Amino acid sequence: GCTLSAEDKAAVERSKMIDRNLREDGEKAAREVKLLLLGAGESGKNTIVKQMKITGIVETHFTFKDLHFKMFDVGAQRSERKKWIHCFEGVTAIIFCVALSDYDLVLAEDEEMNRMHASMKLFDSICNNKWFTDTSIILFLNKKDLFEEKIKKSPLTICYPEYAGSNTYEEAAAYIQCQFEDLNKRKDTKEIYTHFTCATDTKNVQFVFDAVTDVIIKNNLKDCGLF
Amino acid sequence: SELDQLRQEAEQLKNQIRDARKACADATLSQITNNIDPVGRIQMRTRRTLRGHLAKIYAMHWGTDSRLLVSASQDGKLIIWDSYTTNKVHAIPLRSSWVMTCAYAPSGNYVACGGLDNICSIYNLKTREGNVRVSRELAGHTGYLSCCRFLDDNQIVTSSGDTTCALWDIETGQQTTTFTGHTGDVMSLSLAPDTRLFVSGACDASAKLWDVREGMCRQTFTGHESDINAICFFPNGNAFATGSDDATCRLFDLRADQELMTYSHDNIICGITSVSFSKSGRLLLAGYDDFNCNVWDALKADRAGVLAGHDNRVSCLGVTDDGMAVATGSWDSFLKIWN
Amino acid sequence: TASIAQARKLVEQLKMEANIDRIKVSKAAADLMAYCEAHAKEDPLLTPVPASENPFREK
Amino acid sequence: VQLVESGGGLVQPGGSRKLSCSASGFAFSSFGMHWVRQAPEKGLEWVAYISSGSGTIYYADTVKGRFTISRDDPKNTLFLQMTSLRSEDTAMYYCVRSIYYYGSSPFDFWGQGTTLTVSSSDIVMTQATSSVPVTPGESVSISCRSSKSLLHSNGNTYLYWFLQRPGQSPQLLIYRMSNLASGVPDRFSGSGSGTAFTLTISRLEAEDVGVYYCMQHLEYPLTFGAGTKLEL
C-alpha cells in the first residue's frame, strides 16, 4: 500500500523512534543554561568552582532552583581562540574571573607586563568579538580579602598611573571596575554584571542566578519588541 | 655564533629551494588549459534534505558503499544516515558534546569522532550486543582534535592543535608515530588513495606532505597568506587542493614542489571551510562562509556553479567515492545531498 | 644550546627537502589534464546521469 | 548473550498459558522480536512479530485472535498469552531477536526454546529434498524455490538460510542470499534470482551437519521451507 518493503517499514519505525528520542534530548538540553568560564591563569577559577558547589574542557553540571547550569572551564586549553570559540556562539553568558592583586603581581614570563593589563586585553578581545555581541558578561573579582593589604602597600599607579584616588578598597575597586567596563564598545546592547566576592561568599550562585535571569528577560524582551 | 650561522644557512636553503622551484616554471596550467573545451554550466539540484540535528553540524565523511553518512554535531550527537531514504541508522550520544571531527571507516566497522576534549573516541557499530559502544578512547594530545581519518581499521590518523599529527594503533591507544614540525594549529588532513602519504594543513599558512611510514615530513608547501582550514587530495595522489581564510583555493603539485593553481574571485571575501574533488578531478568544490558552496573548474580557474541551499556557514563537505552525489553540511542543522 | 635544538632540525629537514628530483610543471600539468580527461566520462557531476541510474531521483 | 524461554509443559485442550522470553546481553528495547513455532514432525512455522516499540504487531493467520504478545522493555522481556490452545499448537517455541536497518542482521539469534505440549494470499517456498546423503570433505549444493520472486525493485533479496544442529536451536547462516552471519566460517555461500536460489557448501565438517531451512522476509506473515537434513 506504500510501495515500501517490510524491512524498510521497520527501519522507518526505527528512524521515528530515534527522532523522538533526539527531540526529547533537545527539550531537556534547551532547559539547561550554558556558561562559558574564562580567565587568566591563577585567577581562582578553582575557587569559584568550589564556592558554587560545582585535560581539555572541564564540563560540570550544577543545579539551582530546579534550573540547570553547564559550566565549561576552558582555561586548560592551549590553542588560537578564533578557531575553537565558534562552538560557543549559543551560550547565555560568559563568566570572566579576575584576581585584583594582579595589579601588582606578574603572571606572564615577561616581568614588564602587568597581568591585570593582559587580563583586560583578554577581556577586550572577548567582549568585542563578533561572536559575543549579544552574549552578556558576568565578571568576578576575586581575593578582596588579600587585596586591602596590597592597597595599603601598593597604589594602583603601577597598573593605572592615572589613578588620582586614595589608597582605599572602595575607590580603587570602583576605578578598576570602571576601567574593565570601559573596554566594552557595545554598551547599548550588551550588559556587564560585576560582583566582588571572597572565599566565604556562597552568594556567588544566587548572583549568577540573578544575572542569568536578567539576561533571559532582556533577550525575551528584545525578541518580543519591548526593548 | 652558530645560532645565526644555522639560521643563515637555513635562509640559504630556502633561497635554493625557491630557485629550484622557479627553474621548473617553464609553463603554467592556465596557458595549457585555454585550448580545452569549457566545463560548461553545472546546475545541481537538491536531492535529499536530512533533518534531525538540533545544533551546528561540524563534520561529515562518506562511507565506501556510497550510501551511508556520518554527521557529527555539537549537540553531543553523532548520526549515521542512510542517504538513499533519509532513514536514520544510528544515533550515538557522545561523552563530550564539543565535537569538530567525524569519520566513517572504509569497512564500516568503526566510527571516529572528537573535538574539544583532546580525546578521539572510536565507536564499534557491529557488535553481538547490538548496541553502539565506545570501543576505544585515544588520548595523548595536548590540544584539540581538528580532524580524524582512518588509514585502516587498525590504524587511525589524527591532527591536533598542539602543532602535530599522529598515527595511533587503535588496539593499544598508544602513538606509534608523531609528526612534528608545524608551528601553527593543524586543522585538517587528507589521505592519499595509496595509504602511504598524508597531507597536513595548518594555521601557519602552510601544508605538508608527510610520509606516514617513516615519520618525517617529505615536502613543505607554502603560498597561503592566512590559516589553512581544509585540504583534499587529487584522485591520483600527485596533487592536493587547499583552502584558507583568505577566500582563495590553491592547487599544489607534490612532484613539482610548487603552487600550481590559484582559485579566487572578486566577489569572494569569506573564508573557506571545506574542499573536495569529484571522482574525475575536474571539479573542485569549496564551502564558504557566505552561506553557499562553489564549484570551480580545476583546469581553467573559472566558477562552474554554485549551491545555495543553506542559511549559515557551510561546514565540511563530502563526496562519495562513486561521484554519485555531493553532501553538504551547515550550521543550520540540515544536511543536503546534491546530485 | 636551548635555541640550537630547533635550528638543527630545521636545517636537517631543509637538507632533506632540497634534494628532490623535481620535474617540469608542464609535465605534471599534462599528466593531471590527461587523468581528468580519461575519467571525465565517469563523473556524474560532470557528465549528468539519466534518472534510470541515479538512486537519488528514482524516489 | 543469553535468551531464556520458560512457561511450557503439558496443557489440556481449551486452556491457556503465558510463555516468557528473558533477554540478557543485548539492548533488547532496540530490537524487534519474533516468536516461531516448531512442530517436531513438521519443522519451523512463524507465529508472530513484535516491534521494538509499540508499533504494528503482526500475527500468523492461524493464531490471530488467540495469541497476544506483551512486551516489557524496562525488564527486557517478552510474554506470549496463548488462549484457546489446540492439539495442533503442541510445539517448541523459539524467541528470536531481530533488527531492521541498512546492513542490519535480522533473525540473527534464536533462544533455546520452550516446549508447550498440548493435549488431545500467501507465498510458498519448497525444499529440493527433505534428506540427502553427504560425504565428509566434499562440497554440497542445496537449492531452494519460492512461489514468488524474492528480488525487490530495490535490488535486495530476502532469502535467509538457517542451520539447525541436532539438539540445538537453529542459527542464522546467510543474510539476503550472499551475506554471511558473524561467526560463520567462509565455507557457506549462496546465489540465485527470482524464484530459484542455491546454498553452496564447501567441504563438510561434523559441526555443520543438520537441517537447513529457507525463510522468506518479503512480507508478513513469514514462511519457512520444508527443511533439508544432512545425514553423516
Add this chain to the structure above:
Amino acid sequence: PHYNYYATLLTLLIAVIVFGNVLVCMAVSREKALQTTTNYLIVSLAVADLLVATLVMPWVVYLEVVGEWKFSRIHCDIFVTLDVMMCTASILNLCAISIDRYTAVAMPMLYNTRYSSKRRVTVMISIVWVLSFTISCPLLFGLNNADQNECIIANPAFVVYSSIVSFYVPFIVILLVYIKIYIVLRRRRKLVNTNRKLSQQKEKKATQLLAIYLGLFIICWLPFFITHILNIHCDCNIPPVLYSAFTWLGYVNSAINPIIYTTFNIEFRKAFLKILHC
C-alpha cells in the same frame, strides 16, 4: 442627487496598510534572526489587516459615496461578516501578543523554546481565527435583519452580546497583562542598582511602547463600542455622522499597528532597508 466621489480617495488608507502590512510578512520570511513567537502573531495581524483593507474596505468606501446599495441580498452579509471577522481577528491577535509578552517576562524560561513555542503559537493563532469566524458566522445568512434596499445592521442584540467577546474580554485581558508587565519591569529596575546608560532605555521605551499599545488600540477602537453599548441600553439618539467616523477610526488601527510593532525593533529597521534595496 449625485455621488460623493470625493470619498473614493480613501484608497490612500488602503495603500498605507498594504505598505505597512505586506512588508512585515516579507521581513519575517526573509530574515534569519526573525523567527520567534510574536513575529508570527504579527504576521497574522498584518494578514488580517490586509483582508480588512482589500476585502472589506472597498465596500464601505463605495457606501460612503452613495445612499442605497443593492448588488444582492446575500452580498451585504458577506461584506459585514468579513468586517467583523477580520477586526475580531486583529483584536484577538493583539490579545495573543500581550499573552506572549506576559509569557516572556512572567514565565521567562519558556519563551524561545522552539519545541513548545510552535504549539503555543499554533494554538493562539487557531483560537483567534476560529473564534473570529464563529462570532461572525451568525451574520452569514438571515440575522442582519436588513432588506434588499439597505446594507446596515438592524439586529441590536447580536451586536451588544458580540461586543463582549470581541472587545471587552480582550480589552480587560490586554489592560491587565500590560499592567502586570509594567509592574514587573518597574519593580525589577527599581531593584537593579545600575548606574545610567541602560535604565534610560528600558524605562522610557518599555513604558511608552506599553502605553502606546494600549493607547492607540483603545483610542482607535474604544469610541465605537462606547457609542454602541451606551446608545442601546440608554434611551439616547446617536446620529449616523459619528458612527462612520469611529468605524473608520477603528480601521486606522490596522495601519498603525504594523509600524508600532515593527519600527521600534532594530531587527525590523534593518530588514526594511534590505527589502527595499535602498
